[PDB]
Coordinates of all heavy atoms in Angstrom, one line a residue:
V5 N 99.9 90.8 111.6 CA 100.8 92.0 111.5 C 100.9 92.5 110.1 O 100.8 93.7 109.8 CB 102.2 91.7 112.1 CG1 103.1 92.9 112.0 CG2 102.0 91.3 113.6
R6 N 101.0 91.6 109.1 CA 101.1 91.9 107.7 C 100.1 91.1 106.8 O 99.6 90.0 107.1 CB 102.5 91.6 107.1 CG 103.5 92.5 107.7 CD 104.8 92.2 106.9 NE 105.9 93.1 107.4 CZ 106.8 93.6 106.6 NH1 106.6 93.7 105.3 NH2 108.0 94.0 107.1
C7 N 99.8 91.7 105.7 CA 98.9 91.1 104.6 C 99.6 89.9 104.1 O 100.7 89.9 103.7 CB 98.7 92.1 103.5 SG 98.0 91.4 102.0
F8 N 98.9 88.7 104.2 CA 99.5 87.5 103.8 C 100.1 87.5 102.4 O 101.2 87.0 102.2 CB 98.5 86.3 103.8 CG 97.8 86.0 105.1 CD1 96.4 85.9 105.0 CD2 98.4 85.8 106.3 CE1 95.7 85.6 106.2 CE2 97.7 85.5 107.4 CZ 96.3 85.4 107.4
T9 N 99.4 88.0 101.5 CA 99.8 88.0 100.1 C 100.9 89.1 99.7 O 101.9 88.8 99.1 CB 98.6 88.1 99.2 OG1 97.7 87.1 99.5 CG2 99.1 87.9 97.7
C10 N 100.6 90.3 100.1 CA 101.5 91.4 99.6 C 102.6 91.9 100.6 O 103.6 92.3 100.2 CB 100.6 92.6 99.2 SG 99.9 93.6 100.5
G11 N 102.3 91.9 101.9 CA 103.3 92.3 102.9 C 103.1 93.6 103.5 O 103.9 94.1 104.3
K12 N 102.0 94.3 103.2 CA 101.6 95.5 103.8 C 101.3 95.3 105.2 O 100.6 94.3 105.6 CB 100.4 96.1 103.0 CG 100.0 97.5 103.3 CD 98.9 98.0 102.4 CE 98.7 99.5 102.5 NZ 99.9 100.4 102.1
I13 N 101.7 96.2 106.1 CA 101.4 96.1 107.5 C 99.9 96.4 107.7 O 99.4 97.4 107.3 CB 102.2 97.0 108.4 CG1 103.6 96.3 108.7 CG2 101.5 97.3 109.7 CD1 104.5 96.2 107.5
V14 N 99.2 95.4 108.3 CA 97.8 95.5 108.7 C 97.5 95.4 110.2 O 96.4 95.5 110.6 CB 96.9 94.5 107.9 CG1 97.1 94.7 106.4 CG2 97.3 93.1 108.2
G15 N 98.6 95.1 111.0 CA 98.4 95.1 112.4 C 98.2 96.4 113.1 O 97.6 96.4 114.2
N16 N 98.6 97.5 112.5 CA 98.5 98.8 113.1 C 97.2 99.5 112.8 O 97.0 100.7 113.1 CB 99.6 99.7 112.7 CG 99.6 100.2 111.3 OD1 98.9 99.5 110.5 ND2 100.3 101.2 111.0
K17 N 96.2 98.9 112.1 CA 94.9 99.4 111.7 C 93.7 98.8 112.3 O 92.6 99.4 112.1 CB 94.8 99.4 110.2 CG 95.9 100.2 109.5 CD 95.8 100.0 108.0 CE 96.8 100.9 107.3 NZ 98.2 100.4 107.6
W18 N 93.8 97.7 113.0 CA 92.6 97.1 113.6 C 91.8 98.0 114.5 O 90.6 98.0 114.5 CB 92.9 95.8 114.3 CG 91.7 95.0 114.7 CD1 91.3 94.8 115.9 CD2 90.7 94.5 113.8 NE1 90.0 94.1 115.9 CE2 89.7 93.9 114.6 CE3 90.5 94.4 112.4 CZ2 88.6 93.3 114.1 CZ3 89.4 93.8 111.9 CH2 88.4 93.2 112.7
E19 N 92.5 98.7 115.5 CA 91.9 99.6 116.4 C 91.2 100.7 115.6 O 90.1 101.2 115.9 CB 92.8 100.1 117.4 CG 93.4 98.9 118.3 CD 92.2 98.1 119.0 OE1 91.2 98.8 119.4 OE2 92.3 96.9 119.1
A20 N 91.9 101.3 114.6 CA 91.4 102.3 113.8 C 90.1 101.8 113.1 O 89.0 102.4 113.1 CB 92.4 102.7 112.7
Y21 N 90.2 100.6 112.5 CA 89.1 99.9 111.9 C 87.9 99.7 112.9 O 86.8 99.9 112.5 CB 89.6 98.6 111.3 CG 88.5 97.8 110.6 CD1 88.1 98.1 109.3 CD2 87.9 96.7 111.2 CE1 87.2 97.3 108.6 CE2 86.9 95.9 110.6 CZ 86.6 96.3 109.3 OH 85.6 95.5 108.6
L22 N 88.2 99.3 114.1 CA 87.1 99.1 115.1 C 86.4 100.5 115.4 O 85.2 100.6 115.6 CB 87.7 98.5 116.4 CG 88.0 97.0 116.2 CD1 88.7 96.5 117.5 CD2 86.8 96.2 115.9
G23 N 87.2 101.6 115.4 CA 86.7 102.9 115.6 C 85.7 103.2 114.5 O 84.6 103.7 114.7
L24 N 86.1 102.9 113.3 CA 85.3 103.1 112.1 C 84.0 102.2 112.2 O 82.9 102.6 111.8 CB 86.1 102.8 110.8 CG 86.8 104.0 110.2 CD1 87.5 104.9 111.4 CD2 87.9 103.6 109.3
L25 N 84.2 101.0 112.7 CA 83.2 100.0 112.8 C 82.1 100.3 113.9 O 81.0 99.8 113.9 CB 83.7 98.6 113.2 CG 83.9 97.7 112.0 CD1 84.7 98.3 110.8 CD2 84.5 96.4 112.5
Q26 N 82.5 101.3 114.8 CA 81.5 101.7 115.8 C 80.3 102.3 115.1 O 79.1 102.1 115.4 CB 82.1 102.6 116.8 CG 81.3 102.6 118.1 CD 81.8 103.7 119.0 OE1 82.6 104.6 118.6 NE2 81.4 103.6 120.3
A27 N 80.6 103.1 114.1 CA 79.7 103.8 113.2 C 79.1 102.7 112.2 O 79.5 101.6 112.2 CB 80.3 104.9 112.4
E28 N 78.1 103.1 111.5 CA 77.3 102.3 110.5 C 78.1 102.0 109.2 O 77.5 101.7 108.2 CB 76.0 102.9 110.3 CG 75.1 103.1 111.5 CD 75.5 104.4 112.3 OE1 76.3 105.2 111.8 OE2 75.0 104.5 113.4
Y29 N 79.4 102.2 109.2 CA 80.2 102.0 108.0 C 80.1 100.5 107.6 O 80.2 99.6 108.5 CB 81.7 102.2 108.4 CG 82.2 103.6 108.4 CD1 81.8 104.4 109.5 CD2 83.2 104.0 107.5 CE1 82.3 105.7 109.5 CE2 83.7 105.3 107.6 CZ 83.3 106.1 108.6 OH 83.8 107.4 108.8
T30 N 80.0 100.2 106.3 CA 80.0 98.9 105.8 C 81.5 98.4 105.9 O 82.4 99.2 105.7 CB 79.4 98.7 104.5 OG1 79.7 97.4 104.0 CG2 79.9 99.7 103.5
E31 N 81.7 97.1 106.0 CA 83.1 96.6 106.1 C 84.0 97.2 105.0 O 85.2 97.3 105.2 CB 83.1 95.1 106.1 CG 82.2 94.4 107.0 CD 80.8 94.0 106.4 OE1 80.0 94.9 106.1 OE2 80.6 92.8 106.3
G32 N 83.4 97.5 103.8 CA 84.2 98.0 102.7 C 84.5 99.5 102.9 O 85.6 99.9 102.6
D33 N 83.7 100.3 103.6 CA 83.9 101.7 103.8 C 85.1 101.9 104.7 O 85.9 102.9 104.5 CB 82.7 102.4 104.3 CG 81.6 102.4 103.3 OD1 81.8 102.2 102.1 OD2 80.4 102.6 103.8
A34 N 85.3 101.1 105.7 CA 86.4 101.2 106.6 C 87.7 101.1 105.9 O 88.6 101.9 106.1 CB 86.3 100.2 107.8
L35 N 87.8 100.1 105.1 CA 89.0 99.9 104.2 C 89.2 101.1 103.3 O 90.3 101.5 103.1 CB 88.9 98.6 103.4 CG 89.0 97.3 104.2 CD1 88.4 96.2 103.3 CD2 90.5 97.0 104.5
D36 N 88.1 101.6 102.8 CA 88.3 102.8 101.9 C 88.8 103.9 102.7 O 89.7 104.6 102.2 CB 86.9 103.1 101.3 CG 86.4 102.2 100.2 OD1 87.2 101.3 99.8 OD2 85.2 102.3 99.8
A37 N 88.3 104.1 103.9 CA 88.9 105.2 104.7 C 90.3 104.9 105.1 O 91.2 105.9 105.0 CB 88.0 105.3 106.0
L38 N 90.7 103.7 105.4 CA 92.1 103.4 105.7 C 92.9 103.3 104.5 O 94.1 103.0 104.6 CB 92.1 102.1 106.5 CG 91.4 102.2 107.8 CD1 91.2 100.8 108.5 CD2 92.1 103.1 108.8
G39 N 92.4 103.5 103.3 CA 93.1 103.5 102.0 C 93.6 102.1 101.5 O 94.5 102.1 100.7
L40 N 93.0 101.0 101.9 CA 93.4 99.7 101.5 C 92.6 99.3 100.2 O 91.4 98.8 100.4 CB 93.3 98.6 102.6 CG 94.1 99.0 103.8 CD1 94.2 97.8 104.7 CD2 95.5 99.5 103.4
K41 N 93.1 99.5 99.0 CA 92.4 99.2 97.8 C 92.7 97.9 97.2 O 91.7 97.2 96.7 CB 92.7 100.3 96.8 CG 91.8 101.6 97.1 CD 90.3 101.3 96.9 CE 89.4 102.5 97.1 NZ 88.0 102.1 97.0
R42 N 93.9 97.4 97.1 CA 94.0 96.0 96.5 C 93.3 95.0 97.4 O 93.3 95.1 98.6 CB 95.5 95.6 96.4 CG 96.3 96.4 95.4 CD 97.8 95.8 95.3 NE 98.5 95.9 96.5 CZ 99.1 97.1 96.9 NH1 99.1 98.2 96.1 NH2 99.7 97.1 98.1
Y43 N 92.6 94.1 96.7 CA 91.8 93.1 97.4 C 92.6 92.2 98.3 O 92.1 91.6 99.2 CB 90.9 92.4 96.4 CG 91.5 91.5 95.4 CD1 91.8 90.2 95.6 CD2 91.8 92.1 94.1 CE1 92.4 89.4 94.6 CE2 92.3 91.3 93.1 CZ 92.6 90.0 93.4 OH 93.2 89.3 92.4
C44 N 93.9 92.1 98.0 CA 94.8 91.3 98.8 C 94.9 91.9 100.2 O 94.9 91.1 101.2 CB 96.2 91.2 98.1 SG 97.1 92.8 98.1
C45 N 95.0 93.2 100.3 CA 95.0 93.9 101.6 C 93.6 93.9 102.2 O 93.5 93.6 103.4 CB 95.5 95.3 101.4 SG 97.1 95.5 100.5
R46 N 92.6 94.1 101.4 CA 91.2 94.2 102.0 C 90.8 92.9 102.6 O 90.1 92.9 103.6 CB 90.3 94.6 100.8 CG 90.5 96.0 100.4 CD 89.7 96.3 99.2 NE 88.8 97.5 99.5 CZ 87.6 97.4 99.7 NH1 86.9 96.2 99.7 NH2 86.9 98.5 99.9
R47 N 91.2 91.7 102.0 CA 90.8 90.4 102.5 C 91.3 90.3 103.9 O 90.7 89.7 104.8 CB 91.4 89.4 101.5 CG 91.4 87.9 102.0 CD 92.6 87.6 102.9 NE 93.9 88.1 102.3 CZ 94.7 87.4 101.5 NH1 94.6 86.1 101.4 NH2 95.8 88.0 101.0
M48 N 92.5 90.9 104.2 CA 93.1 90.8 105.6 C 92.2 91.3 106.7 O 92.0 90.6 107.7 CB 94.4 91.6 105.6 CG 95.4 91.2 104.5 SD 95.9 89.5 104.5 CE 96.4 89.3 106.2

């Protein structure tokens, strides 16, 4: 539900991320689209 380190909610983005993942987006591009820049959030 939340980023282990910082506390940002990450539970409401997995389906969005999977939608992005259907396309040829690299795992980094999906996070960029979802706006998760700190690596603490991205690791999640």
Side-chain angles (χ1 to χ4, degrees):
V5 182
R6 294 186 179 218
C7 168
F8 301 130
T9 306
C10 78
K12 189 172 191 67
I13 277 72
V14 302
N16 74 338
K17 294 176 181 67
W18 186 246
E19 299 302 324
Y21 180 77
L22 289 175
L24 272 41
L25 262 54
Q26 205 186 14
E28 301 81 9
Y29 280 70
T30 168
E31 308 95 293
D33 293 343
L35 286 161
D36 286 350
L38 297 169
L40 303 191
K41 283 292 183 185
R42 290 183 296 282
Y43 62 90
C44 68
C45 303
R46 291 175 120 257
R47 167 280 311 264
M48 305 303 305

